Amino acid sequence: NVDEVSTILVMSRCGELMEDSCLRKRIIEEQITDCTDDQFQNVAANFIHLIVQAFHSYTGNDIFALNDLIDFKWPKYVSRITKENIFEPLALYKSA
Amino acid sequence: FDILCVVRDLVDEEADERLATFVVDSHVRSHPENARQRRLQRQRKKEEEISPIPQELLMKYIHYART
Amino acid sequence: FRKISRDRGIIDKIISSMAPSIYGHRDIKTAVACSLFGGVPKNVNGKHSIRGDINVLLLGDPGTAKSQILKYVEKTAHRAVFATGQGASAVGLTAS
Amino acid sequence: DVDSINFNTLDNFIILLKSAFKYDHVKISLIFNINTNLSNIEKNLRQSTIRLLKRNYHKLDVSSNKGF
Amino acid sequence: MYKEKMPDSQANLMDRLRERERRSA
Amino acid sequence: RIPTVAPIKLWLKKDVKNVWENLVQLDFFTEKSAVGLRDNATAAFYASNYQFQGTMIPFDLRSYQMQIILQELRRIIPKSNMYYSWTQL
Amino acid sequence: ILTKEARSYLVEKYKELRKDDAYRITVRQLESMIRLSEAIARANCVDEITPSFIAEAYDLLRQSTVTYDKYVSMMNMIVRKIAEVDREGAEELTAVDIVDWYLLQKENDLGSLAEYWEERRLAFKVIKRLVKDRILMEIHKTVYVIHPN
Ligand SMILES: Nc1ncnc2c1ncn2[C@@H]1O[C@H](COP(=O)(O)OP(=O)(O)O)[C@@H](O)[C@H]1O
């Protein structure tokens, strides 16, 4: 089910995306001293939920298709993360 | 006949916009609103707003040319 | 009249003067004006004759003011008669 | 010559080669000779395989004509 | 139009409906 | 059928392709002359050899037939679905 | 009498209709739109033909649990309210914020104090239906924003 797919992708890709090189480069560039792995997971979960709610009708309740969108849009989504978007996912969505 | 005028009601954004903005102003003009002289002056002002020749003069000109 | 006649390019003013509230259709307005002014009924040597008036047919789709133009010729020409196709009879048009 | 290749067979072959990633000692590179554009590939291949290709791809115009 | 932009009434909207009701008769 | 403004996305033809593929994977659609699974290996060899017309014609022009009739759709689709009103003609 | 901005609104809406026939709409339908706006204002005390009247005439000629019309009426209001704060950049709206605003917009149409809770509950149900249709996107307050569709 849609809820099942949403929970499974969050359970799966969170640790995969919490440790990618691009985000830890951008954190250094943006000097995010208060960033923690708990907030890292929350940012990844927000990303995944946003993709799911935007593209479930496009992909269906399919794990494989959503994974590839999560991989592709992840660099470009990271490029819009700045000092102002650490705590407001709404603003990051607006930028993205 | 001598002249045959064929008309197509084909659709186009620019032509339709021009036609609609002309028609709406025509319907604004034709709507109602020495007083005789003043009202004749206002009517001729509205005629000038849309035609280069006053229409009574045009009628007389046509009659004179035909005569 | 002679003051008006000397204006350069008087023909365009006359053509633009026909039915001002009707937008466009300049190729029809010119024909209407030409039929209003008409030509010369040259009764050459008496024994031969040529009609002096121009006949105009307005053919087109509905919503093209093929009818309201006649409601300008009827109000502009010195003597105009208006009839509808099905509201006329052969006896009625010609002679009774 | 990609355009003349049966795209269903190509898609199945790509999925087959995908199984090779379980081996730690194998690396695979793909060269696509395209005549017109990415449009034919996007039309003919399944949208699942396109996502497999797109994760790491490069685009290069090697035509003999380039801005005079 | 959008004239009713900020009529930030309290729970007095229930009393407003009471005014609507009790005098309609 | 919606009131207008005083001063429901039509999805692009390209994004629909994934939905079209999903509807063929899940056996709702089928080809016009789909023989399906062959009975024996000898016929299966020939089937894997021969290339049908459906393997060459464009993606958007491949004819399909339906396994579920609209009567069953209206019987199964909940009335609370926003496209239930379109289940009939 | 036609208002000046009503002319621009009318030509825009006429082009919108003319695009859809690529019966077929002619200029007679533009005159009909003017005539129907005139008739609607003729059933009212104001001669100013506001764009709302032309919108109503456009809807009446172009269109040729909870009831259909009552539900669809709230959708335009809520979408326009959210698009307003989209342009303003103000704080985003929760479900309660939308419900209270919508009730304020229809204070004069309510019949009784009992109908207050009925309409509030109907509004929440309509919000849930819209979310199920993905015309509104829920983000985290429980923030509702215009869906990417
Ligand atoms: N070119 C045009 N410019 C302005 N108004 C027009 C034009 N064509 C048609 N109209 C409007 O549409 C109506 C057409 O009436 P009518 O002459 O009976 O149409 P038709 O004879 O072409 O079927 C007129 O009242 C006129 O106001």
Provide DSSP, A7-69.
HHHHHHHHHHHTT-HHHHHHHHHHT-TT--HHHHHHHHHHHHHHHHHHHHHHH-S-HHHHHHH
Contact in structure between G107 and G118 (CB atoms under 8 Å) = no
Report the phi/psi class of residue C19: left, alpha or beta, with left for phi > 0 and alpha for psi in -120 to 50: left
For this experimental structure, what is the resolution in angstroms?
Answer: 3.7
CA distances to C11, C14, F21 from C7, in Å: 9, 11, 73
For residue D38, give the amino acid letter. Answer: L
For residue G43, give the amino acid letter. Answer: A
Among F residues 4-63, those touching chain G with beta carbons less than 8 Å apart: 4-9, 11
Bridge partners of C56, per DSSP, are B3
Residues of D whose CB is below 8 A from F14:
42
Q: Which of A64, A65, A72 sits opposite D54 (nearest CB)?
A: A72
Alpha-carbon G10 to chain mean position:
17
Q: Is the dihedral of CA F32, F37, F38, F41 positive or negative?
A: positive
Copy the structure tokens of residue G149. Answer: 């569709």
State yes or no: chains F and D have 3 or more CB pairs below 8 A: yes
**Could you give the CA distance from residue G52 to residue G9 in angstroms, rounded to a whole number?**
10
To which residue do tokens 């102003």 refer?
B25
Partner-chain contact A54 G148, CB within 8 Å: yes
Number of alpha carbons in the 13 Å side-chain half-sphere of residue C5: 7
Partner-chain contact E9 G104, CB within 8 Å: yes
D25 touches chain F (CB under 8 A): no
Partner-chain contact B57 C16, CB within 8 Å: no
From D57, D31, D27, F22, select the one nearest A72 (Cα to Cα): D57
Copy the structure tokens of residue E16. Answer: 């407003």
From B2, B6, G28, select the one nearest C58 (Cα to Cα): B6
Q: After which residues is chain B broken (C to N over 2.5 A)?
A: 33
To which residue do tokens 């062959």 refer?
F38
Alpha-carbon G1 to chain mean position:
24
Report the phi/psi class of residue G143: left, alpha or beta, with left for phi > 0 and alpha for psi in -120 to 50: beta
**Could you give the CA distance from residue A76 to residue A52 in angstroms, rounded to a whole number?**
17
Strands, E assignment, G1-149: 136-139, 143-146
